[PDB]
């Protein structure tokens, strides 16, 4: 299944799935937002939203009940403060919330009582289907 | 009846290998051992399997849960997990002489597939930022 | 008639705590009660590092002060009166006895 495929080629395969599998909405700020306070430029690849989606539905598929203030820590990283020492900074909550809301508006994941987000039965199904098709 | 559950330890990382009598399966945290993913230190996790041979594992499944430490320390802990788990399996279920065999192949290559490193991170002492280093001294 | 009684003990000294902790367990072993204990919880070390000098001259030398606090738990099934009969023996100084009723 998903743990038998390398997580790089799998995310490439899934992020190609959501592309040619129907569609989802895409905000009217996707081309301008940096995805993190500490980032320097927006994501280099124009097809990053889908990557960020395919990489992100694998998080809920291997875990259970992850909020947004946990995804911000997931995709946060090192922030360099110029002449002061660098520290750890969290990414932006707007993209994190929006991709989950879209996965809801496709039925891959759903919000969870007791808080958090959980993979759906059908969302589990297509992830293992696509996993079956990765070299 | 074959089942043993043997651990391996490094700086702070610990791995634990649970064994069943299955077919060939080796999985660390649910993923195939083929995919432990600092890949430069990938032949290190495979060191025991090529040291014994896949054939010596034709009738066991290994579920290895690893935790703590860092990437290299977890790889070395897993190494020790395969090695000591195989030694214990041949100890308790196969034979006392053919575990001596595998022990000698494992311990001629490297003595720390079976014995863990007692090395730990030395504490820090005031007057410098480090165990041994001190603040730079100025006279004038 | 049988509840779930949890008795929690805290101390700064290991031995004075463990004497009382064994005494309670054995006093509840004579009554053929279900004693699920003692459960040991991670020692809490309260640490304060302070400069030895009062005036800030010389080599800067520090002393690290520490209080170790130990947390034991004993589990019982009884009525609160039988346990109050048991937890009424002579208690060494420094030991906290804080019996409650779990859900």
């Amino acid at each position: 299944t998903v743990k038998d495929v390398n997580p790089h080629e799998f995310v490439k395969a899934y992020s190609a799935h959501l592309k040619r599998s129907g569609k989802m909405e895409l905000p009217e700020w996707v081309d301008i937002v940096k995805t993190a306070r500490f980032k320097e430029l927006p994501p280099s690849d124009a097809d990053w939203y889908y990557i960020r989606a395919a990489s992100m539905a694998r998080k809920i598929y291997l875990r259970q009940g992850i909020g947004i203030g946990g995804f911000q820590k997931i995709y946060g990283g090192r922030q360099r403060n110029g002449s002061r020492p660098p520290h750890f900074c969290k990414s932006s909550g707007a993209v994190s919330r929006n991709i989950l809301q879209e996965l809801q508006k496709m039925g891959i994941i759903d919000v969870d009582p007791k808080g958090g987000r959980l993979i759906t039965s059908q969302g589990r199904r297509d992830l293992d289907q696509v996993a079956g098709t990765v070299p | 009846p074959g089942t043993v559950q043997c651990f391996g330890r490094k700086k702070t990382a610990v791995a634990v290998a649970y064994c069943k009598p299955g077919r060939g399966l080796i999985k660390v945290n649910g993923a195939p051992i083929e995919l432990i993913r600092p890949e430069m230190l990938r032949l290190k996790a495979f060191e025991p399997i090529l040291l014994a041979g896949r054939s010596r594992f034709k009738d066991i499944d290994m579920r290895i849960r690893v935790r703590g430490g860092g990437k290299t320390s977890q790889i070395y802990s897993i190494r020790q997990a395969i090695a000591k788990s195989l030694v214990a399996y041949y100890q308790k279920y196969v034979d006392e002489a053919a575990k001596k065999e595998v022990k000698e192949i494992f311990a001629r290559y490297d003595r720390t597939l079976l014995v863990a490193d007692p090395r730990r991170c030395e504490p820090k002492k005031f007057g410098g930022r480090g165990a041994r280093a001190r603040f730079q001294k100025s006279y004038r | 008639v049988q509840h779930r009684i949890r008795i929690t003990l805290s101390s700064k000294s290991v031995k004075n705590l463990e004497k009382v902790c064994s005494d309670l367990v054995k006093g509840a072993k004579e009554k053929q009660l279900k004693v699920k204990g003692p459960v040991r919880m991670p020692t809490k070390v309260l640490n304060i590092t302070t400069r030895k000098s009062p005036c800030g001259e010389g080599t800067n030398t520090w002393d690290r002060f520490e209080m170790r606090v130990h947390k034991r738990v004993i589990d019982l099934v009884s009525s609160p009166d039988v346990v109050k009969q048991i937890t009424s023996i002579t208690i060494e100084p420094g030991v906290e006895v804080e019996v409650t009723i779990s859900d």
């Binding site: - | 600092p38 430069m40 230190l41 290190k44 060191e47 490297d110 | -």
Partner: protein, 193 residues
């Protein structure tokens, strides 16, 4: 020579010939105890004198790559560097790159040096011999420093700079940093013989 364990599962440790009997005991490639898949063994050397004569030469060379502070502790990068160096070396010489490395180490070791000793009452520098272990030590030092100094402020990758350094030192050609430094140390030593 029944030894089927190979570096990175590619390079056979059989058929590596050390010509210098002088350092043959201080290069660890010839015996079966010294064959390895990988040059990253968390070995507890340095604990005793002459222990690191047992450390595999490929590991010693890799250990000498992680230098100048911004590279301290970065061993996985150095192992990847050595991997690519070796692929390039066999993609140039079509020969076993362990032999090329060992020939370069042998060829890049000075055999004389000049230091200030006190004779009969007065100090001044005389020439002295170099022990085999310090010969190997200095050989690796020179090759690695040469490669690192080539790679600085250059579009050439440190792997390729290292590969060129090792092939040139294995040839013995007086164009690598290692050979020129070896010969200059030995000339300063001869001058004060």
């Amino acid at each position: 020579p029944g030894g089927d364990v190979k570096l990175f599962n590619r390079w056979t440790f059989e058929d590596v010939q050390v010509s210098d009997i002088s350092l043959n005991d201080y290069l660890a490639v010839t015996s079966m105890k010294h064959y390895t898949f990988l040059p990253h063994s968390a070995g507890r050397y340095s604990a005793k004198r002459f222990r690191k004569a047992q450390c595999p030469i490929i590991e010693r060379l890799t250990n000498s790559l992680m230098m100048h502070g911004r590279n301290n502790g970065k061993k996985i990068m150095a192992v990847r560097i050595i991997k690519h160096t070796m692929e390039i070396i066999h993609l140039l010489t079509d020969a076993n790159p362990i032999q090329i490395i060992v020939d370069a180490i042998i060829n890049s070791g000075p055999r004389e040096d000049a230091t200030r000793i006190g004779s009969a009452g007065v100090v001044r520098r005389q020439a002295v011999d170099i022990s085999p272990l310090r010969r190997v030590n200095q050989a690796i030092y020179l090759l690695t420093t040469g490669a690192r100094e080539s790679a600085f402020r250059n579009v050439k990758t440190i792997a390729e700079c290292l590969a060129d350094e090792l092939i040139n030192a294995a040839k013995g050609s007086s164009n690598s940093y290692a050979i020129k430094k070896k010969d200059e140390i030995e000339r300063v030593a001869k001058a004060n013989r």
